[PDB]
Symmetry: C3
Subunit: 91 residues, 3 copies
Amino acid sequence: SSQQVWKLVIITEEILLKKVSKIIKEAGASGYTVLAAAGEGSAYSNIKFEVLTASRELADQIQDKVVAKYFDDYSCITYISTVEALRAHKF
Amino acid sequence: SQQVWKLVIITEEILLKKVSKIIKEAGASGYTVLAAAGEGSRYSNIKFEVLTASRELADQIQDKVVAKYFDDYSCITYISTVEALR
Amino acid sequence: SQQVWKLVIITEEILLKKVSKIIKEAGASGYTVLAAAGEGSAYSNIKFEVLTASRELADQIQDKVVAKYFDDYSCITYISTVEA
Ligand SMILES: Nc1ncnc2c1ncn2[C@@H]1O[C@H](COP(=O)(O)O)[C@@H](O)[C@H]1O
Ligand SMILES: Nc1ncnc2c1ncn2[C@@H]1O[C@H](COP(=O)(O)O)[C@@H](O)[C@H]1O
Ligand SMILES: Nc1ncnc2c1ncn2[C@@H]1O[C@H](COP(=O)(O)O)[C@@H](O)[C@H]1O
Ligand SMILES: [Cl-]
Ligand SMILES: [Mg+2]
Ligand SMILES: [Mg+2]
Ligand SMILES: [Mg+2]
Ligand SMILES: [Mg+2]
Ligand SMILES: [Mg+2]
């Protein structure tokens, strides 16, 4: 059977790659995945972070700090969803 | 905290401009595209991700792209829900 | 529309061929793969997405890739539902 984990998505400009990774890591996430992305909002010059955490509270802390620091001045969207992972694994 | 719909459309790279036009014309605030490869029934393809506050616009955009390109082009599509801010 | 299951596997690019074989030999109708980078416990990784008509098929694919590769390679895997 399975354990609930939270998946935090942050899509932002590529220039924020180092700062946002450091925020994810200093908040205690076990890792993150980055994908190269393009898009339009309101080539592949955006980055999509996906951060998995078994703590909904850790996902909120990361999202809150990235939104406070960079949402005003940088193209940034963010959202959260749940996924199921194997009980034996650690997120 | 609001519930939002995520529409994924995986199709051939060559449809990039035409599908982006369908998404923008239906009134979606934007979209994300990623490079992809894969196998199916019929790097090569593009994955669209479109977030829409209403399920109706998600379905609307899906209807259009499917009608116009499904039977002629490599093309899969699905919808999930996510939690966003505002 | 109907509920389907989406299996994600994130692993090293060196396992591409061998994970795709597990996927197709298990009876999945297909798979998608995206280049990825990241850190755990640049774009050296790949993310599989496998849509399956049943949970059990997603579970059997995940059980096999994990049993073969989780201990010696980078292997993140999780499952969610979508409507198609
Ligand atoms: N409705 C949407 N659906 C999916 N992705 C979006 C949407 N709106 C914005 N984005 C993504 O967020 C990026 C930045 O948004 P913005 O800050 O509005 O420029 C875009 O380039 C897209 O990658
Ligand atoms: N079961 C599946 N799971 C994930 N992606 C799929 C699946 N079937 C097809 N695809 C994707 O859709 C593309 C085109 O599908 P097709 O029209 O069946 O050739 C493939 O190259 C894959 O990227
Ligand atoms: N908590 C996480 N959230 C998102 N992606 C992760 C997470 N942990 C690991 N990853 C991804 O999985 C890859 C392998 O992780 P590892 O198995 O710890 O080397 C990493 O390089 C990331 O792409
Ligand atoms: Cl940065
Ligand atoms: Mg600035
Ligand atoms: Mg797992
Ligand atoms: Mg799982
Ligand atoms: Mg997919
Ligand atoms: Mg795992």
